[PDB]
Amino acid sequence: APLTATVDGIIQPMLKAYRIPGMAVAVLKDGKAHYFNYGVANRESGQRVSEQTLFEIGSVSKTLTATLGAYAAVKGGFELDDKVSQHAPWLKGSAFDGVTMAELATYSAGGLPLQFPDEVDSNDKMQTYYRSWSPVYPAGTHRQYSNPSIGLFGHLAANSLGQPFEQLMSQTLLPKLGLHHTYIQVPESAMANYAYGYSKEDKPIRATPGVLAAEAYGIKTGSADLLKFVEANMGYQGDAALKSAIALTHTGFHSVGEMTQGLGWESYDYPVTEQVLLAGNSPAVSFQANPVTRFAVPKAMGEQRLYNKTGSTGGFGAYVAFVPARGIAIVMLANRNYPIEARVKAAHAILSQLAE
Ligand SMILES: *[B]([O])([O])[C]([N]C(=O)[C]C1=[C][C]=[C]S1)C1=[C]C(C([O])=O)=[C][C]=[C]1
Ligand SMILES: [Zn+2]
Ligand SMILES: [Zn+2]
Ligand SMILES: [Zn+2]
Ligand SMILES: [Zn+2]
Ligand SMILES: [Zn+2]
């Protein structure tokens, strides 16, 4: 069917059902970007959503952090199989003597939690927290989705090149990817484009600052820049190091059921059913530890995959999925944190129609 009717017919009922004030949708098909914009960025002002509206993308940020980490590895800052304490002198002698950088990146260090404990909320206390942490599971055996885990990976990866994370992201990675309207901290000059998010009580909210927030869930961007990053994941040509870095993000390290964990990106064998894609993105996988299917060696996952990432903040809900072999992708950025199941069902419906 026609593209506008396909997208509208799936997105509009969902926006009504979940009272989502605004959504920017971007689709890749036939080598071209297409933008579908709904509703408002700011309920009070009535500013309309466009592909230039800045949304909080939450944990979709982890795909950019993972790309930065891979870039630092390609540039020689570390090897993925290095022990974490080789790259954090303050962790020498801790449990991180027995955890690799790859395990940190892929949530398999041994039971680091979803969030930092409440008062682990300064750099000093963060260091003490990791230095004193007692593993729950042997390294590499269990996947427990974790902000502290990938957060530390990003932080250490940037330090391995001698820079803070925010500097390496903003001055090197984003410009090299051609993302010039993507930010960790939205500058005053771009504030007019920044949406508000909406809480369950319909109050306007924005992201909460926090330890390793930048690395784990801190990016603000619009659908056009985010789709440009997806395009770089479909086939990128340019900086050899950045090309290699993106390839590393498509390497699989272990699996949990039908989901294979990469750096940032999670993927599925394609074609993939709605049921499987939902399950891989459900709480049984995202909010509890699971034993992994170990890989003999990390594997390039290739083009016949659906790669995806969910992300949220208090006021925002994002999802991205792409299928390189079919030249199709979707970005959906909303200013309500609405259920992941709805995001996945809508994206799967649209992608299925894009592949006919
Ligand atoms: B990520 O998976 O979206 C990540 N995001 C955050 O920690 C930022 C949020 C602040 C309030 C709601 S999300 C994350 C999200 C969740 C979650 O949705 O319960 C859990 C762990 C990490
Ligand atoms: Zn178009
Ligand atoms: Zn405190
Ligand atoms: Zn940091
Ligand atoms: Zn540090
Ligand atoms: Zn720039």
Residue numbers in the entry: 6 to 361
Give the published text.
Plasmid-based extended-spectrum AmpC enzymes, such as the FOX β-lactamases, are increasingly found in clinical isolates from antibiotic-resistant infections. FOX-4 is of interest because it rapidly hydrolyzes cephamycins. The first generation of BATSIs inactivated serine β-lactamases (Ambler classes A, C, and D) through a dative and reversible covalent bond to the active site serine nucleophile. In this analysis, the structure of FOX-4 in complex with SM23 and LP06, a ceftazidime mimic, is described.
SM23, a chiral cephalothin (CEF)-based BATSI, bears an R1 side chain with a thiophene ring and an R2 side chain with a m-carboxyphenyl functionality. While apo enzyme crystals contain one FOX-4 chain per asymmetric unit, SM23 (CEF analog) complex crystals contain two chains per asymmetric unit with an RMSD of 0.27 (0.52) Å between Cα (all) atoms. The boron covalently binds to S64. The two boronate oxygens adopt positions consistent with all prior BATSI structures in class C enzymes; one oxygen points into the oxyanion hole and the other takes the presumed position of the deacylating water. The carboxyphenyl ring of SM23 (CEF analog) binds in the canonical binding site of cephalosporins, via hydrogen bonds between the carboxylate, S318, and N343 that are mediated by water molecules. The BATSI carboxyphenyl ring appears to form parallel-displaced π-stacking interactions with the side chain of F293, a residue that is unique to the FOX family. Additionally, the thiophene ring extends out of the active site and does not make significant contacts; instead, it veers away from the Y221 side chain. Overall, the SM23 (CEF analog) adopts a similar shape in both FOX-4 and the E. coli AmpC, with the positioning differences apparently linked to the side chain conformation of L119 and the steric bulk of F293 versus L293. Notably, the amide carbonyls in both structures point toward N152 in spite of these side chain differences, suggesting a common requirement for binding. Since the carboxylate of the carboxyphenyl ring of SM23 (CEF analog) binds in the canonical region consisting of S318, N343, and R349 in FOX-4, this interaction may be the most significant one for increasing binding affinity.
